[PDB]
Design a binder for this molecule. Structure first.
Ligand SMILES: Nc1nc(=O)c2c(CCc3ccc(C(=O)N[C@@H](CCC(=O)O)C(=O)O)cc3)c[nH]c2[nH]1
Ligand SMILES: Nc1nc(=O)c2c(CCc3ccc(C(=O)N[C@@H](CCC(=O)O)C(=O)O)cc3)c[nH]c2[nH]1
Ligand SMILES: O=c1ccn([C@H]2C[C@H](O)[C@@H](COP(=O)(O)O)O2)c(=O)[nH]1
Ligand SMILES: O=c1ccn([C@H]2C[C@H](O)[C@@H](COP(=O)(O)O)O2)c(=O)[nH]1
Lengths: 263, 263
């Protein structure tokens, strides 16, 4: 069961050559989807060693409502370096919108807490939504949100999550995005008293950068292994999880594959 | 080629019983997708007669940035009646967000014009996005946006559009939503000098209302016919299209099937 590798393969073989903002060049398809059953295992890719430490801290950083890379650096995470100001600022990106979307009245909306409240008290709501796409603040962001809009759903005590990702760096970004949202779904489920269901990833521009092609072919030559299991320590609040609360059990990946990020 | 009917059938057979805000009861699935090749024909369903007049005026109404039902009524369209105030107001819904999203600076952002500008000047942009999900204004809206977030993509001068729809009334709402966004994509393509490509519909809570079940079974018993063709008269601006500019050629549906709307 390898939704990611299958999509990666499909784009590599059928994607159209496309120019891009970074001036790197891509092969690209539009409107592709992946589904993972989280109850079957944690979707941390096994066909290459994914630096889950960076995934976990990045998500914790989002949950803090932070947009300065300082806290990431203190924890040894450098994935946001290339877009940050000299003072470490990224503008009001993901975390700021998730935790403190500025409402016209001057109040700040905590969408994460609001979503959790709905999961607990109105699980059948069709409005359990979090958006990072704050149209009036996009221009202030170092990069507009890639993982932009997501929704939760509950069936028979099982929590599902669907993400709309407008732009998908398939080799570097997407493995992080999948693991990040899977982890978030486990967190939200834990806090809402639910089990985990499906993660559905829906992409806009799904692309392989032209300087990632050798890395992709290498990865696609490897046989998938069983997924690890995620174990999350007890906390009374999603905002109280720490890195140490997050345990990935039996992660047995093939070797890491290095590739340069498009800036 | 019937993406809609196939999804309708899938939800009918496998959707799970779910309670809902309206108190009507539904059968529902999460994270379902449909794809239409707009170059093959205009996706106005032929398995029942769809009131395209209401579809077309509703879209024109959105493009006006209007949120009062008066203009709809003047043109014989009643589909928004049940949620409007006594003075016809719906709050800052689709049209208001599309044309005049209020920025923190006091300025209003015309996302439709902005998207068209990108299509014309930077077709490879991965940021051609329109959102109606204005978190700070949701509570003022009579209903939060169902068709919430959409994106355009251009490959070899061909325009595709993907919609994220968080909540999908499969029998009544979705046939309108499909035709609406197909029409919008034609309008954008015409204004940007592009041909039409794919419409990708991505749904969150995809449901059939419990009082639509008989109607659904009836529709699913019918053999689909060829789709009609859409002809748009020339205009120098998307905001100058009128109803009379929009011609559906050779629309040959099976009979209309009436159903009550859930409020
Ligand atoms: N073009 C582009 N793609 C993106 O996904 C991205 C984002 C998402 C955050 C991000 C940035 C770089 C890497 C990444 O470099 N991961 C490497 C190294 C991870 C580590 O060891 O530091 C990898 O091999 O996964 C993984 C995730 C910020 N700006 C971006 N710009
Ligand atoms: N539950 C719910 N579903 C929705 O899709 C919806 C929306 C979208 C606009 C909408 C409302 C009713 C009908 C509809 O009734 N169409 C009927 C009659 C069309 C006509 O002839 O006036 C049809 O048979 O398609 C078709 C489209 C507003 N609030 C809603 N609430
Ligand atoms: O969590 C993220 C953040 C960014 N991107 C990628 C998509 C593009 O390759 C690049 C952003 O560039 P634009 O789409 O904004 O041009 O980073 C991801 O894949 N995942
Ligand atoms: O263009 C639209 C507007 C609304 N809805 C449906 C989805 C739900 O059945 C209802 C909205 O109710 P909530 O999801 O907000 O509870 O209207 C659509 O299918 N298409």
């Amino acid at each position: 069961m390898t939704p990611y590798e299958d999509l990666l393969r499909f784009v590599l073989e059928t994607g159209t050559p496309k120019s891009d903002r970074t001036g790197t060049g891509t092969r690209s398809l539009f409107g592709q989807q992946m589904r993972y059953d989280l109850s079957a295992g944690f979707p941390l890719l096994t066909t290459k060693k994914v630096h889950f430490k960076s995934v976990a801290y990045e998500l914790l950083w989002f949950l803090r409502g932070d947009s300065n890379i300082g806290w990431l650096h203190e924890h040894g995470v450098t994935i946001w370096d290339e877009w940050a100001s000299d003072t470490g600022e990224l503008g009001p990106i993901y975390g700021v919108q998730w935790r403190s979307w500025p409402a016209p009245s001057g109040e700040h909306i905590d969408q994460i807490s609001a979503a959790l409240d709905l999961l607990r008290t109105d699980p059948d709501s069709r409005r359990i939504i979090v958006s990072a796409w704050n149209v009036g603040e996009i221009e202030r962001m170092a990069l507009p949100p890639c993982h932009a809009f997501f929704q939760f759903y509950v069936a028979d005590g099982r929590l599902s999550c669907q993400l709309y990702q407008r732009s998908a760096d398939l080799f570097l970004g997407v493995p992080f995005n999948i693991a990040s949202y899977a982890l978030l779904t486990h967190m939200m489920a834990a806090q809402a008293g639910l089990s985990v269901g499906e993660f559905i990833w829906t992409g806009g521009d799904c692309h392989i950068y032209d300087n990632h092609v050798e890395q992709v072919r290498l990865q696609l030559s490897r046989e998938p292994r069983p997924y690890p299991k995620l174990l999350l320590a007890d906390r009374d609040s999603i905002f109280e999880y720490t890195y140490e609360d997050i345990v990935v059990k039996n992660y047995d990946p093939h070797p890491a594959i290095k590739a340069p990020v498009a800036v």
